[PDB]
Amino acid sequence: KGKQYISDVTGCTMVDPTNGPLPEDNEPSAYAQLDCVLEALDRMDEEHPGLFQAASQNAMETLMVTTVDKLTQGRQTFDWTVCRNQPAATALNTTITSFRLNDLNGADKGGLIPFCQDIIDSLDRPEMTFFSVKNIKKIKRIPMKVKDKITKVEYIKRALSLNTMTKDAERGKLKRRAIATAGIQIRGFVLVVENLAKNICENLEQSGLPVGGNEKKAKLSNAVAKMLSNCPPGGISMTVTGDNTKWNECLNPRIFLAMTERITRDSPIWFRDFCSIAPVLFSNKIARLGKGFMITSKTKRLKAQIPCPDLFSIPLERYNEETRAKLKKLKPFFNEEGTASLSPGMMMGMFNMLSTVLGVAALGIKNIGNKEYLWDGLQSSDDFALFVNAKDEETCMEGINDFYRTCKLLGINMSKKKSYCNETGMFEFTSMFYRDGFVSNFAMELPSFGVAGVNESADMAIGMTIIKNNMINNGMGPATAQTAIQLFIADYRYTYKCHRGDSKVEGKRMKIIKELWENTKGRDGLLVADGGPNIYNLRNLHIPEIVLKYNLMDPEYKGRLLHPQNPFVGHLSIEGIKEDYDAVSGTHSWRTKRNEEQCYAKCCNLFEACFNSASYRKPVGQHSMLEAMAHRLRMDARLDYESGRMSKDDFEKAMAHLGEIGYI
Amino acid sequence: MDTFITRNFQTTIIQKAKNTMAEFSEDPELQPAMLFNICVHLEVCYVISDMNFLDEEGKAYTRPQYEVIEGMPRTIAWMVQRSLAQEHGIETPKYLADLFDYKTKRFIEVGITKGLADDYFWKKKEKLGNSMELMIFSYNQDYSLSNESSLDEEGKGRVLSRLTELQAELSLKNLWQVLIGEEDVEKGIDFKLGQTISRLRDISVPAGFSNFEGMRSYIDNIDPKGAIERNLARMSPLVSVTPKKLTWEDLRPIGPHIYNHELPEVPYNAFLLMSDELGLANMTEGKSKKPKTLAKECLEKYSTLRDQTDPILIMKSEKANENFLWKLWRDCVNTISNEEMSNELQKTNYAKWATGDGLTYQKIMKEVAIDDETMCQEEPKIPNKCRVAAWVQTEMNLLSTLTSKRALDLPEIGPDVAPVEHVGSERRKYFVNEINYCKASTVMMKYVLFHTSLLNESNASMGKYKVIPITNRVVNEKGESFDMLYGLAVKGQSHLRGDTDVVTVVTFEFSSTDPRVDSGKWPKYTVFRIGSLFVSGREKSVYLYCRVNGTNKIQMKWGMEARRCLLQSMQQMEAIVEQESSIQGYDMTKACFKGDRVNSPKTFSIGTQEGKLVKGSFGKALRVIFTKCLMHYVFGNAQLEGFSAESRRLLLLIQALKDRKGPWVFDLEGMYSGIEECISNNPWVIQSAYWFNEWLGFEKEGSKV
Amino acid sequence: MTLAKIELLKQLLRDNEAKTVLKQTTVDQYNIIRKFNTSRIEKNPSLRMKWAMCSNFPLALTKGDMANRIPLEYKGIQLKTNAEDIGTKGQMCSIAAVTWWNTYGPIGDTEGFERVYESFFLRKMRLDNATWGRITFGPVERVRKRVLLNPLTKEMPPDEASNVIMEILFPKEAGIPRESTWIHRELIKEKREKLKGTMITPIVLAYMLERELVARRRFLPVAGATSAEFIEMLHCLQGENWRQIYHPGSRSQSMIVACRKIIRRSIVASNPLELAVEIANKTVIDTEPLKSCLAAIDGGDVACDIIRAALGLKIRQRQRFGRLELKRISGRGFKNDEEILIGNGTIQKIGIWDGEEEFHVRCGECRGILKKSKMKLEKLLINSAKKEDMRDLIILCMVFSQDTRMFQGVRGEINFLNRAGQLLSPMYQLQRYFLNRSNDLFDQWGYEESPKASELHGINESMNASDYTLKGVVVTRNVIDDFSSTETEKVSITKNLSLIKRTGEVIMGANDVSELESQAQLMITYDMGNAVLAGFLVSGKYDPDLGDFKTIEELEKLKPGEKANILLYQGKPVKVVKRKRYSALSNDISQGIKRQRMTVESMG
Ligand SMILES: [Mg+2]
DSSP states (O other): OOEEEEEEOOOEEEEOOOOOOOOOOOSSSOOHHHHHHHHHHHHHHHHSTHHHHHHHHHHHHHHHOBGGGGGGGGOOEETTTTEEEHHHHHHHHHHHHHHTTOOOOGGGGGGGGHHHHHHHHHHOOSEEEEEEEEEEEEOOOEEEEEEEEEEEEHHHHHHHEEEEOOOOSTTTTTSOOOOEEOOOOOOOOOHHHHHHHHHHHHOOOOOOOOOTHHHHHHHHHHHHHHHHHHOOOOOOOEEEEEEOSSSSSSSHHHHHHHHHHHSSOOOOSHHHHHHHHHHHHHTTTTTOEEEEEEEEETTTTTEEOGGGGGGGOGGGSSHHHHHHHHHHHGGGEEEETTTTESSSSSOEEEEESHHHHHHHHHHHOOOSTSSSSSEEEEEEETTEEEEESSSSSHHHHHHHHHHHHHHHHOOOOOTHHHHOETTEEEETTTTTTETTTTTOOOSSOOOOOSSSSSOOOHHHHHHHHHHHHHHSSSOOOOOHHHHHHHHHHHHHHHHHOOOOOTSOOOOOOHHHHHHHHHHHHHTTSSSSSGGGOOOOOGGGGGSOHHHHHHTSHHHHHHHHOSSSSOOTTTTOOOOOOOOOOOOOTTTOOOBBBBOOOHHHHHHHHHHHHHOOOOHHOOOOOOOOOHHHHHHHHHHHHHHHHHSSSOOOHHHHHHHHHHHTTOOO | OOOHHHHHHHHHHHHHHHEEEEEEEEOOTTHHHHHHHHHHHHHHHHHHHHOOOEEETOOEOOOOOOOOOSSOOOOHHHHHHHHHHHHHHOOOSSOSSSEEETTTTTEEEEESSSOHHHHHHHHHHHOTTSSSSEEEEEETTEEESTTSSSSSSHHHHHHHHHHHHHHHHHHHHHHHTTOHHHHHHHHHOOOOOOOOHHHHHHHHOOOOOOSSHHHHHHHOOOOOHHHHHHHTTTTTTSSSSOOOEOOTOOOOSOOOGGGOOOOOOOOOOOOOSSSSSSOOOOOOOSOOOHHHHHHHHHHTTHHHHHHOOOOOOEEEOOOOOOHHHHHHHHHHHHHHSSSOOBBBBOOHHHHHTTTTTOOOOOOOOHHHHHHOTTTTTTOOOOOOOOOOOHHHHHHHHHHHHHSSEEEEOOOOOOOOOOOHHHHHOOOOHHHHHHHOOOOOOHHHHHHHHHHHHHHHHHHOOSSSOOOEEEEEEEETTEEEEEEEEEEEEOOOOOOSSSSSSSSEEEEEEOOSSSSTTTGOSSSSSSEEEEEEESSSSSEEEEEEEEEEEEEEEEHHHHTTTTTTTHHHHHHHHHHHHHHHHHSSSSOHHHHHOOOOOEEEEEEEEEHHHHHEEEEEHHHHHHHHHHHHHHHHHHTSSSSHHHHHHHHHHHHHHHHHHHHOOOOOOOOOOHHHHHTTTTTSOOHHHHHHHHHHHHHHHHHHHHHHH | OOOHHHHHHHHHHHHHHHHHHHHBBBBBBBHHHHSSSSSOSSSSHHHHHHHHHHHHHHHOOOSSHHHHHHSSOOOOOOBBBOOOOOOSOOEOOOOHHHHHHHHHSOOOOOSSSSTHHHHHHHHHHHHHEEEEEEEEOOOOOOEEEEEEESSSSSSSSHHHHHHHHHHHHOOOOOOOOTTTTTTHHHHHHHHHHHHOOOOOOHHHHHHHHHHHOOEEEEEEOOOSOOHHHHHHTTHOOOOOSOEEEOOOOOHHHHHHHHHHHHHHHHHHHSSHHHHHHHHHTTTSSSSSBBBGTTSSHHHHHHHHHHHHHTOOOOOOOOEEEETTTEEEEEEOHHHHHEEEEETTEEEEEEEEEEOEEEEEEEETTTEEEEEEEEEEEEEEEEEESSSHHHHHHHHHHHHTTTTTTHHHHHHHHOOBBBBOOOOOOOOHHHHHHHHTTTTTTTHHBBOOOOOOSOBBBOOOOOOOOSSSSSTTTOSSSSOOOOOOOOOOOEEETTTTTOEEEESSSSSSGGGGGGOOOOOSSEEEOOOOOOOOOSSSSSSSSSOOOGEEEEEOHHHHHTTTEEEEEEEEESSEEEEEEOOSOOOOOHHHHHHHHHHHHHHHHHOO
């Protein structure tokens, strides 16, 4: 019911529900009025002096320091060069490489601002050259890099495009939904906007600093107690347990652009423009559609997948009724290249902090028309709980109705089927059930207590630390923790074929474990990986078993296990020692075999090998790595020659090689 | 940056730099880089002007040789410069100087830069001239001095080392690159918007705005006052929560269609038999052996059943080929009993069609599909709407009872010294005492082991057909360990690298229940009569239930994690005990389970008979909870998740009704429809709906009284 | 080994991509280059490990004399192999080989192992020597606080710890020792002594020392002892419905007393700010100036916060008022001057707050929420910790609220001073007057009907668990956790030592320091160690006239004043001069400031 037009930049069909007709029914509505959103944000600013300015300044200062490598953190990202989903590091380095071919060298400048500037610039280049994977049949399918080109419009579509899939392992829902991932072009801007939103929402008491562990219980208890105290004498306080489903489909990126503009009211124009790019790229987003439909004939026992670019090449009469109607309604927004323009709404997980800020702004109205009720609540990532204090149940229901209608004006829809109300003192929030001052969070599935699959020592340390952390945070009781220890030890013994030497189990490693069982006098000092007895209990979950058994180890067993020069340890395998678990180095500290990639890999491996410090702490310098490598190699060769560790011919060869490099 | 300045510069330098910035009306906070540069300049100047004095003869040695002029107000510095020039009879520089050298009686300008020292030296000389001497130092260990005797080695080296240390510290903090030299310090972080992004911004504004500049101005200038109130007044009154006070009468039975006797009875669809299971037992010393050898030995003990080669079909489901399934079973037996050690089936071609693998459609290129008018899209298959079945209640009754055999064994943990671990040990002892011997534990262990074997063999082999025994290790009260063989399975073409495609599994499982007793429970099973047994001197027929099923690697993995049911079944109980332990000081585990001097044992309402509710011990409720978790695992799918999630709301509403919290519902039929859309064919969901209706009736009666 | 290094460097240089990346990329940017990896980490780690452990040779063995000690096979089991490899050109091995090595193999030497891993052994010593008590199964009152997870040998900011570890483990790459090495010279030397004679990989030692030196703090619920010794064992001591008694087997107090003494000395004299900063930056605690540990901890005591504000440092924005810790929640309050008559009959002109406001209030072990309007207290909700804390919190909140009832409740006089003999503002005088006479405003405050509710219960004027509570005072049998969103916003300092926000609002007060004396546990003083590369000063560029560079031991042979060629940090060839004396930039800068100011004064 909004405004339908055609995007001149991309040619897609755009829909604008913002500032549209007010809803006339109880169906979901995206027609959020801008003036109402600005009213809510102005109220939020009034109740929190200088929170917007502080958050904007903090976000700007953190952005000035953030580097390009920060984009390597996250999950699978859309890669335009291959139009696929690839890890963040893969997509980032592919984009950096393909930008060099286009004379966009902002990545080499370090900081995130120049890289994002080059990302913005890339949208203007008349063409776009990159390296694409091409498979040749030589019969073997060999993939290689080919210098491919795409004109401007296709590149813009790829940059604005959002890859899609079906969310997996989403318990509590009968039917599935669509989860989406974005490319590298919007990653940095989204990062900055999310940092700004988090800075805002950590101060808000309704949302609170995003709480983890048992801070949720404290938040719920504080909210209930505060509301009950605020309740007038002889009045009634009612809690609404609310739940919005598909509430991100009625949230408009234009509204979020307005919120970003309002939040940064007093900031340099450069940061105001920088923070306005994620909403801009989300309002013009393109939704890549799955992998197509499959049509089969059973009189011929044939099947064939129809790629999405060819959805409408088949008469609609050859689809099932539901798919027929879906395609018939999708035709207006279908793009010839196999995508559908999706301007309104927002996919899950993109703007969580910003949406929470909007929800808290809705909560902070607290009243309508100076009526005899006050409402306040908690908001977090699509889940909200409301509390209304009034003088009777009728007035509380009037307040709840007013809150519902007000939320309709901001694009926030609450599920009437999933939301209910009762007297204050019993409710639920973020799958956490409060009742009479007792909170019963029982929706966090305890992670399967099995080996983390990194190596024996590290796996044992990780498992014990995980059990202890569960005890500390998730209210795990003593007996449950002990049973968790037992289950983890069972899984650990099963995975690594390390059963007690006195057991009757057989295997390749178990024969040697049995031998060690009797060849070793001190039997309680053996690590469990060596057939030793487990000695972990609640009290000693924070001390490595290598230390825990040091005094009981036999004189030779500790030496063998703790032999300073043993072959099962390599320096390059220590990168993951930190990420956090506390352990020790020993024969059980081995690594797994490996199942511009190799260029960077080998260059950095050599860099670390020459200087063992680069692995631990960032090196410092204002010169090429090659010259520093050459100089340190010269010093090493001279030291070896002086100390007799190297011969005259070896040093002569080293100097000849260095001159070949050109540093003599 | 301010942290860097504070850490690396004294408060005096910061104060002097701030004063200098204030004199020029430059805000240090808005231009931190300029403040840092001024601080560095002051530091280097003061360092240079140290340890240098003039003796009586006037020669430099270590009255000061150097007098600092930088760092004081503009007026005071100008007075100092003019007074020095007049006293020493030297021309007063037109530009304020930094230091003054009495030995040479000259004005010295100190500067710093990031680039080559020579370039900055030339620039400064051009800007100021030769009227004053020029010392320039650069961060790259290079410098330019007009006179080399002005500064000895020590001073220049010290300033160079300080600059290098500052550079390294800045590089560590990722601030050196952000840092900008004095030439560019009078700037910001430039970020210009292009053309395409500018246009996209222009075409992404709400209705009523022509460009983004108009939107920016509107948000910056106009103040909204009563916009929410203005819009609520003109909103239609049909937009409302429509609240309605909830009452016991409003609550009604869920899924009334489950009482419709026209619908078919719910069939048994669990992966393996649970209450009807039969396990051939072979007593062993405890030595662990390969599953193939265990199955071979168990079959060898029961040679009459193994050698049975004439099937007596009892009922073929709808389409299963009796010949295919029987020949596949015989192939399984022969493979298990062969002298080889590989478990792969020896046919590999008959098994291709017996399992139905060969009856798979052939992919064709999309073009032929487009041109072929007879290739359509298969209509979605909707789950059948079934009614309550009497076998789910029987399974619930049977699985939550103590047996003579326990299959649950867990590792040991270190001794207990603290009292807390002692109470944890006591709680664990009671829990495992009331859970070790229940049949649900044996069924759970069997499921876990079978799924582990399935996943291992799927990883090992993909394109061949393998035999996987359904095996368990079961220890009884006397401490005897039996190997229990519950049947065999043929795992077929697992051409599945992902975790969302079907892998065929044909399961042949021993059982003693007559399929004709409850014909409506086994419409998916082709069952033969393979023999008879004397369990305790009494004859019992031995049937073989055959069924073709499918799995996914994710299903096998999550089956491997059925053991967490145990955890789920203890946390709960622990909480209960904790509550009691909170009510009265001493630990209530002993009191809760079997009672004590001053507390009778805890009891829970477990079921009913003839419409009268029945109570049971804490252990019985424990077994019921464990069986509930096990059934949630066994019958878990989208339907069960949806039903549980949607019925949680009704449970909480009923709890609010019980406590007299005056609950309200904005719409009740929507919630009821959401709950009832998940009750189609899952046995556990339908039985849970029946149980929920029964409990709701009991709760209504309790509310009446 | 360097032979292989140069060979592989040449091999890399063979292709042009290596040549362009190596020369184009600097040393600093290498970090980014490190993160552009495959990112092909396993999706199912546990399952992949289970599958790998069944493979014949899943371990990547090293090449060396020790590795070859492992038999080719042992009693049928093929421990290792001689097969060639393409993925890494290495050798593979079986876990059975690890078991054999731990069973039959060369016994190594273990003498420095305990010293290297002394932290974990100290943890086990604390556990072993501890004594246990009894369990209280009743509900426990836990409080959310920031706590240190494990004990530390010494607490430094991350940068200081990183520098210290760099100094210890890597004698090379130690250019221009910062103002942190001579601070921890004893620590550096003891670490070097303990870590000499050990062949353990340097990166493992670096991470271990980082754990042992960098403070790890987290917001945890604690009940009772908050020292890291108890926090490490928190998983066993604490519980939602149980409690246990546990007895495990410094510079902070000295810093507190020093800061309080500095504040007391400065306040008495005019222009306290200048005197305070002079004493602060001229102070030392046995090895270091005050700006060595003040940055180590975020915030702290009120005196420490004031001193940090006087210096250049960041502090928490939490408000302090006597013994009350206040965190604002919402609302804008305007401080306007107003003339109010006190119950004594006198009239005082004081600043009153206009506008509703709310605070998370803490005092001792008591926490609560106070909502107050202008010249009135609206509501106060508190937990139940202890009688004294309840009384103090109630009195201080009533004083802060500036309710007219408190003003009417004044019966004595307000003319008190401090230990220095100074007249205080009416607010603090009223606070002291009410604290001294607790049963003064409570009697005339008024009573209210008990908070009829399931859990909200009232507290009488006697602090006993009885009905008929004070007007607006409610006690909730719940947990109130507060003090979130620590921004450390910018704070200005006035000449009177009273901290203020970005605007004119005042957060900290000079008198907020408690007038308590503790002497000092350390030696307060008012005015071979150090580190490697400490007697040399960078001067000039490479200057290839010296040819190759020289090592530290070679460097020490040179007499003072000789030029040497050194590699600074990750390369950076520079020329240095052996220092003939010991340098101190702070002393030189102070002398320069003194010369400048004495010049100006003499001219004046
Ligand atoms: Mg909810």
